[PDB]
Amino acid sequence: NPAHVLFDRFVQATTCKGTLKAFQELCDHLELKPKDYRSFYHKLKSKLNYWKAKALWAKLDKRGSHKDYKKGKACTNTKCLIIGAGPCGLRTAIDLSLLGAKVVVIEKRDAFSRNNVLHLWPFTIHDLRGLGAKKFYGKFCAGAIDHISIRQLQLILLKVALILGIEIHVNVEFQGLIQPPEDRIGWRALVHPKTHPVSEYEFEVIIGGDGRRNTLEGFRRKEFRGKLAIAITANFINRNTTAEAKVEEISGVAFINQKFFQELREATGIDLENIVYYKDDTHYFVMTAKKQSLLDKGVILHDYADTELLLSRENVDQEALLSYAREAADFSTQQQLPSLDFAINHYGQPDVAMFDFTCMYASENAALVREQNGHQLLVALVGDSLLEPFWPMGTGIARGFLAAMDSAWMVRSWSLGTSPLEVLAERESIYRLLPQTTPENVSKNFSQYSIDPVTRYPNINVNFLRPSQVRHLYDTGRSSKLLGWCQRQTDGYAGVNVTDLTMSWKSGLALCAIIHRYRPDLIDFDSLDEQNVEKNNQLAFDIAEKELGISPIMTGKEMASVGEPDKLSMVMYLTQFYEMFKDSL
Ligand SMILES: Cc1cc2nc3c(=O)[nH]c(=O)nc-3n(C[C@H](O)[C@H](O)[C@H](O)COP(=O)(O)OP(=O)(O)OC[C@H]3O[C@@H](n4cnc5c(N)ncnc54)[C@H](O)[C@@H]3O)c2cc1C
């Protein structure tokens, strides 16, 4: 069965682009429209009768049947935008999908490239298994493995997300919010490129899952400055031989082995406070190295006053850095690994990297609400943008996923009509615990974990803060859409300037430009003479009729002499181009 082959190719895809393409090919073959999100998942599992697929349906159905989701109707009418397809953005997206919301994720990259390896708490392993992780990554947490690379976690969550009808757009950089206009269009996003279909999306919830670079306004950062702290990560090719399998992991609770560090410093000049080894798709090491040792070995060329000069690509000898990392890895595993060949990163270089942990950040607040021109927008942070992890402690995914579930619960309460201040008060009451969570003070009964915070935080007081304590987090300060669409799509075209839906169309160049924007094979826009008003109009009209099936409302000569085109007719005509092409860039 060809649909089975397409499903297999989707499941087995090894890149973000390859996953998106296999999924689109599966949907086309099955004649399914993911953008009709309220029915997509049910139609897909009805149409695809494949034993492999049915195994996955049972897991997702079981997850979605929890009473917290209200059978998928708690958020049926809520539109959410997620910034970032990292693990925490995608995990949030997935729970928002199970509540019935429409969800769109925009991601500025188009590849999952990070090889570094993430520690997983037991509850997260159980969460991921329950989402079908093993059907996308057969080796997932095999035996006593409790880690996974960043990019493999991204691939699993991407696949789950696509199955549920979540929309994922790569090569889209979020730049800002666009307030609603006056007098009905809601909140929108400024994205690059602004011609992207997602510029049409109006949403009531936006989630910042874009790590440190996140620049949603209204989230003041708390700074935690400590002693100079430098971490080095490294990945080596893992050929899964028997020699390689025998080498024992180094857990990262193991450093509390200080004699080893003294021996290592005296034998090699490498002075570490901690080193971690995970045996995963790569042999992954992370270590924290003292500044003086890195100068002594030539990794850092000059000792600058403070760090961002100290750790600049100009002040760091890459070959010495590679040597230092390999040497530390080899000694820490006692030269039992046959070979230490660097895996190759995004840029085609050996995969070593250095990071500054001297200052870490966390948002004062997880959420806020914006209201303008009658439209309310729930804004919240999740993941590294909310609370930065110190990798050796293994809290990144655990607290990202707690906050993902907390955010889902917040959006559930929003959609059910809870007043904004009570939504915020509850969210902030939950958020106050996040930097105290450990595998032992968080709930133990994984089989009953749900987005309901009571299932995850024993004895939580969700009314710790009063609504009056979060007043400062509520901030009060012609199809116009069609017009805005034509403006963005025609921007940059010589001779065109769309300021209305009548006068700006008499020359014919604007519509020729709309056609060229989406079907450059049908028209040479550059060859056109702006003075040939009748010829250019009629060319646009004929192409649209013959190639696009849009019936003309007038002739070129009628347009060339009209004075002002009827606007009801202009709008009926232009809207057909809008509907044909708006989702289609
Ligand atoms: C280079 C690097 C190495 C790391 N190494 C380790 C490690 O060894 N061990 C460890 O435990 N943790 C490590 N981490 C942290 C770990 O990746 C995160 O804790 C984890 O992935 C969860 O973070 P997140 O999903 O919130 O954000 P991230 O994983 O940072 O994902 C953010 C996503 O948002 C996208 N994005 C950013 N800005 C925009 C925008 N304007 N528009 C659209 N998309 C945008 C980014 O491309 C990215 O895909 C590393 C992080 C980085 C950046």
Numbering used by the authors: 10 to 192, 197 to 269, 271 to 491, 520 to 627
Sentences from the paper on this structure:
MICAL is a multi-domain enzyme that is highly conserved across most animal kingdoms and participates in actin cytoskeletal reorganization. MICALs oxidize two conserved methionine residues of actin to methionine-R-sulfoxide in a stereospecific manner in the presence of NADPH, thus leading to the disassembly of F-actin into actin monomers. Here, the first crystal structure of human MICAL3, which contains the flavin-containing monooxygenase (FMO) and calponin-homology (CH) domains, is reported.
The final model structure consists of the FMO domain (amino acids 10–491) and the CH domain (amino acids 520–627). These two domains are connected by a flexible loop region (amino acids 492–519). In the structure, Cys97, Val126, Tyr298, Asp398 and Trp405 interact with one FAD molecule. In particular, the indole ring of Trp405 stabilizes the flavin isoalloxazine ring of the FAD via a coaxial stacking inter­action, while the other residues interact via hydrogen bonds [Figs. 1(b) and 1(c)]. The CH domain of hMICAL3FMOCH is composed of five α-helices and contains a conserved actin-binding motif (522-SKLLGWCQR-530). The hMICAL3FMOCH structure shows that the CH domain interacts with the FMO domain, as is the case in mouse MICAL1. In particular, five residues, Lys523, Arg530, Gln531, Tyr620 and Leu627, in the CH domain interact with Lys207, Thr208, Pro210, Glu213 and Glu215 in the FMO domain. There is an invisible region (residues 495–517) between the C-terminus of the FMO domain and the N-terminus of the CH domain in the hMICAL3FMOCH structure, with a distance of ∼25.3 Å. Essentially, the calculated distances between the FMO and CH domains are ∼25.3 Å for position A, ∼48.8 Å for position B and 68.9 Å for position C. Therefore, considering the distance of the invisible region, the CH domain of hMICAL3 fits position A. Furthermore, we performed electron microscopy followed by single-particle analysis to identify the relative position of the CH domain in hMICAL3. Based on kinetic analyses, the catalytic efficiency of MICAL3 dramatically increased on adding F-actin only when the CH domain was available. However, this did not occur when two residues, Glu213 and Arg530, were mutated in the FMO and CH domains, respectively.
